PDB file of C-alpha atoms in Angstrom:
ATOM      1  CA  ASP A   1      13.777 -12.888   0.360  1.00 16.24           C
ATOM      2  CA  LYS A   2      15.483  -9.769   1.705  1.00 17.36           C
ATOM      3  CA  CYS A   3      12.035  -8.285   2.309  1.00 15.47           C
ATOM      4  CA  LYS A   4      11.300 -11.198   4.625  1.00 14.03           C
ATOM      5  CA  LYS A   5      12.585 -10.488   8.131  1.00 17.71           C
ATOM      6  CA  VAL A   6      12.181 -12.655  11.229  1.00 15.61           C
ATOM      7  CA  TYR A   7      12.059 -11.267  14.766  1.00 14.91           C
ATOM      8  CA  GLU A   8      11.118 -13.445  17.733  1.00 12.83           C
ATOM      9  CA  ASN A   9      10.803 -11.300  20.855  1.00 18.51           C
ATOM     10  CA  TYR A  10       7.569 -13.204  21.436  1.00 18.37           C
ATOM     11  CA  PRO A  11       7.835 -16.921  20.551  1.00 18.36           C
ATOM     12  CA  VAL A  12       5.107 -18.834  18.721  1.00 17.40           C
ATOM     13  CA  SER A  13       3.099 -17.958  21.826  1.00 14.98           C
ATOM     14  CA  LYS A  14       1.311 -15.290  19.795  1.00 18.51           C
ATOM     15  CA  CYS A  15       1.769 -17.001  16.434  1.00 16.33           C
ATOM     16  CA  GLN A  16      -1.141 -19.088  17.706  1.00 17.09           C
ATOM     17  CA  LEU A  17      -3.276 -16.713  15.646  1.00 16.08           C
ATOM     18  CA  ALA A  18      -2.247 -15.835  12.095  1.00 14.62           C
ATOM     19  CA  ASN A  19      -3.866 -12.501  12.938  1.00 16.51           C
ATOM     20  CA  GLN A  20      -1.417 -11.867  15.775  1.00 16.61           C
ATOM     21  CA  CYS A  21       1.802 -11.920  13.755  1.00 14.69           C
ATOM     22  CA  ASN A  22       0.584  -9.311  11.274  1.00 15.37           C
ATOM     23  CA  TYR A  23      -0.444  -7.098  14.188  1.00 14.19           C
ATOM     24  CA  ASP A  24       2.924  -7.372  15.931  1.00 11.57           C
ATOM     25  CA  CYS A  25       4.756  -7.521  12.604  1.00 14.07           C
ATOM     26  CA  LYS A  26       2.909  -4.382  11.515  1.00 16.47           C
ATOM     27  CA  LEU A  27       3.286  -2.632  14.867  1.00 16.76           C
ATOM     28  CA  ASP A  28       6.841  -3.876  15.375  1.00 16.64           C
ATOM     29  CA  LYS A  29       8.540  -3.755  11.978  1.00 18.89           C
ATOM     30  CA  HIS A  30       5.561  -2.499   9.977  1.00 15.23           C
ATOM     31  CA  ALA A  31       5.005  -5.568   7.804  1.00 15.48           C
ATOM     32  CA  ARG A  32       2.122  -6.375   5.464  1.00 15.96           C
ATOM     33  CA  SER A  33       1.066  -9.938   6.257  1.00 14.04           C
ATOM     34  CA  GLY A  34       3.487 -10.819   9.051  1.00 10.63           C
ATOM     35  CA  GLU A  35       3.402 -14.517   8.187  1.00  9.50           C
ATOM     36  CA  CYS A  36       4.857 -17.152  10.508  1.00  8.63           C
ATOM     37  CA  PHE A  37       7.562 -19.601   9.444  1.00  7.41           C
ATOM     38  CA  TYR A  38       9.632 -22.500  10.772  1.00  9.38           C
ATOM     39  CA  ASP A  39      13.184 -21.718  11.874  1.00  7.00           C
ATOM     40  CA  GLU A  40      15.990 -23.819  13.341  1.00  8.69           C
ATOM     41  CA  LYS A  41      13.794 -24.283  16.408  1.00  6.49           C
ATOM     42  CA  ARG A  42      10.889 -25.468  14.263  1.00  6.41           C
ATOM     43  CA  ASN A  43       9.080 -22.637  16.040  1.00  2.00           C
ATOM     44  CA  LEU A  44       6.528 -20.344  14.404  1.00  5.34           C
ATOM     45  CA  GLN A  45       8.166 -16.925  14.133  1.00  3.67           C
ATOM     46  CA  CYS A  46       6.190 -13.946  12.840  1.00  5.71           C
ATOM     47  CA  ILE A  47       8.137 -12.838   9.769  1.00  6.42           C
ATOM     48  CA  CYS A  48       7.534  -9.285   8.562  1.00  5.36           C
ATOM     49  CA  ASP A  49       7.377  -9.267   4.765  1.00  5.49           C
ATOM     50  CA  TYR A  50       7.648  -5.923   2.982  1.00  9.88           C
ATOM     51  CA  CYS A  51       7.221  -7.184  -0.578  1.00  8.41           C
ATOM     52  CA  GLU A  52       5.236  -9.472  -2.877  1.00  8.94           C
ATOM     53  CA  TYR A  53       6.162 -12.924  -1.584  1.00  7.35           C
TER      54      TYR A  53
END
């Protein structure tokens, strides 16, 4: 949804740990769960979600 925003900056490199995204997602865009997802590059991108997915 609109609350879900994706920002690479650091490729799946960090997404290696579901705990990393949230950190960066929280420190970067201030997300809640910063969950990874698959984009056009089938890469895991930490998506900052500010809502109730």
